Symmetry: D2
Subunit: 257 residues, 4 copies
């Protein structure tokens, strides 16, 4: 079937990519980077992130596979020495799906995040009213906020004190960035985990310009009226050829390998 391979760009990844293409030439496989059914990423989680956003409009029709040429990644969880076996097994697997985060920015633009979406100020103080399902929950003062997908909880969310969620749980997690807490300003402090169909809305107080990130991309948005967070109805699909449990991936990346 139709496939394509993106590469980190270094010598190691490009030649691993050329070898798999050559290996795919021995099977009924058509290279196509317009409408592929299989997207293979060779590099790190950053390369996989780019591969995801390159084809975020055909998620229901693509099974992703990640190969790590360097250290173990959470999305690129195949060793390079397994590419030939990967080519073989891919020629003739099941699919597992991870939840995604929908970000809506009204002034309206919508973005999909595999890891997380963050909001920071354009330079001055960051102050937003946090609204959960249309009820005002808190007025946040600090450096910013981060809304994480389950699989994204091992990334930026983890460094901010958030919990690690198993990707089978359809949820999003909001964590604070250096929140001010005194007698007058008050935030919840704890990370918040929201289920499907809950809407978290960030609304300006004085400044209306925000630096909004979605995975690796970060754009300054001007005259923002609202930022809306919710678990996406779309999901990313992985091709699994064996058992690599998420908690084992966490152990291999953080405890020891």
């Amino acid at each position: 079937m139709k496939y394509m391979i993106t590469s980190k760009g270094d010598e190691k990844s490009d030649l691993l990519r050329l070898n798999m293409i050559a290996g795919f030439g021995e099977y009924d496989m058509e290279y196509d980077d317009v409408e592929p059914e299989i997207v293979i990423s060779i590099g790190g989680d950053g390369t996989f992130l780019s591969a995801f956003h390159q084809y975020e409009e055909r998620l229901d029709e693509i099974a992703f596979i990640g190969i790590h040429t360097g250290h173990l990644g959470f999305y690129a969880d195949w060793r390079p020495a397994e590419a030939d076996k990967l080519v073989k097994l891919l020629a003739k697997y099941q699919k597992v799906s991870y939840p995604l985060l929908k970000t809506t920015v009204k002034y309206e633009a919508t973005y999909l995040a595999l890891n997380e979406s963050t909001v920071k100020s354009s330079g001055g103080p960051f102050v937003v009213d946090v609204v959960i399902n249309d009820i005002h929950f808190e007025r946040f003062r600090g450096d910013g906020l981060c809304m994480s997908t389950p699989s994204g909880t091992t990334a930026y969310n983890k460094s901010l004190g958030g919990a690690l969620m198993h990707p089978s749980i359809e949820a999003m997690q909001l964590t604070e960035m250096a929140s001010i807490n005194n007698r007058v300003y008050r935030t919840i402090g704890s990370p918040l985990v929201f289920p499907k169909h809950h809407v978290v809305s960030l609304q300006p107080v004085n400044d209306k310009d925000f630096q909004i990130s979605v995975d690796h991309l970060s754009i300054l948005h001007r005259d923002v009226q609202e930022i809306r967070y919710e678990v996406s109805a779309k999901k990313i699909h992985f091709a699994r050829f064996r058992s690599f449990p998420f908690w084992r991936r966490v152990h291999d990346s953080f405890i020891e390998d």
Copy 2:
């Protein structure tokens, strides 16, 4: 139908209890503390916790209601001035259900937790191997561990840095208590959120005696071979007469009321 009322024991709660019993006498309502269909708790979350464990063998046949004579509780979320209206509406509501945590202690005893279950040492050093779905995840050294239900995340779990989970998510959350982290000992540090059907097993390394807590109860267990944590198949059922959202309960308890 059959009902009963437990009380904090102070003058305020006992006389609120006697007034509701008198109010129930004007309706087709039978007091029965053996097989009640409605269990009303008057006091704080501690009183509600006791009411829960008093009838933990008839959870599928009981709808709980909590009344707070003091400050707002997460389970006792009815003001005392609403008892007469509560009696009326209860005479003729829907049910919402929260997940529970199953704790298995092998030497075998099983316990149900509405808030959380914690493990600490019997005095010496606390060292356990943490096993997730039969794979060894980490060797924990520290003061102890805490496995929290969703509704329990606002309690002990919150004070340990855990995330607040909406009770619609069937999950459990494990948080660390003063874990040692240096070149030789290594824990994940972050809280871990587990879905249904994941089993977390704590296993001794040297000392086999542990102080195990389940909600308010805390018992020293001797010659422990394993402690097993998993989301319970049983659920607690609340009688809801109006909308009091969980995130609003969080806001009222922690931000301001």
Copy 3:
């Protein structure tokens, strides 16, 4: 003696300033904003911060006084209703001194901080080697670092998990901003408190452009070779007319007033 008064700029502060000037006119007091011996700040800690940096070249010859027209500040710890008494007592007090932080940026520029100095990347990843007294301590990956003065520990340092230090201790405190910690990248995690004469040096790894903040000021520095942190030999001097203990100031600002 010579004095001057800076104001927040609102109607409340300007008219409090005009009343104190009028009150000072009844005494042997000369207004002079070039070489004052007494600098009075009317507003918040931000106004006091500006008053400090306005005269940072005559610190050994100035006693600062802060008046808070809004909430209690840590530097502006005089209520507006005490200005007349303040004018009187100032006409005829002792001095207490707080440590300051010296920041050296080599490409060489030196800055003095009353609260803290922070380092962040110019957009990309922030990676610096942390060198303590010429020995390499760690390679930091994350959002940035913050070096705080003692009196500054109640400000940005506090929101990042740092400890509150009594200003009698001549020290500086380094805290991390969302540090990455996995199998490959490793930071200390804990805040670090350094005594006088210890030098903490930040040194680039790839990117050489950093956004460096000093109190309220924040400037993008290009082609940085090193950022050096050390407890300053200069100190800020406060005019004290009564006992307002630091721990009481902490209690009034964070516990309740």
Copy 4:
């Protein structure tokens, strides 16, 4: 001069101890475990802790030396292969001194801590009023409190989120253990660093029985009226034969060796 050697008790430490005693026999050195001038500890920091408390009444007359038969310790910072060189150099060094923590328990007993002193409840809820220099600072609700010496900040204090203090700073650090924070109960949250001559006093609210730890020792104290913390006037003295900086010790123990 007079000396003695304490041992971990394993085969490795006992025979290292016998070899150094034999090596000391070739010099003008007298073994004496009653009034030694040099106390050598062979084992880990736990062995050194025991050696410290064994001679805590002759601290002004003893220079301590620690040898680690296992991993690197913060007090036992000499490799076993250097014992012969240690014997030689000790035969003919300077002294460095670290601050200590004085704990007073009134009902009156006083204890000295090299690492820290902690307070927990006897089983029920732990509630204490925290008083700093006779002013009431906070009412603490939680699992307990920990007051750490500077060199103790790398131990229990570190696991509780406290800052690492260089031992040249004469100070103590108070950190919280799972403090409850909601609308009604409020603690400072941040670690507190106190200078010399500041007195921190813990005072009961309901329960008067506390489990008080001092380094490795932990005793249940009954009918406590007050627990007083302050930087001790006594200091521990180390024999230094070379430069092993504290920050290097921190790096070797926590970053990598």
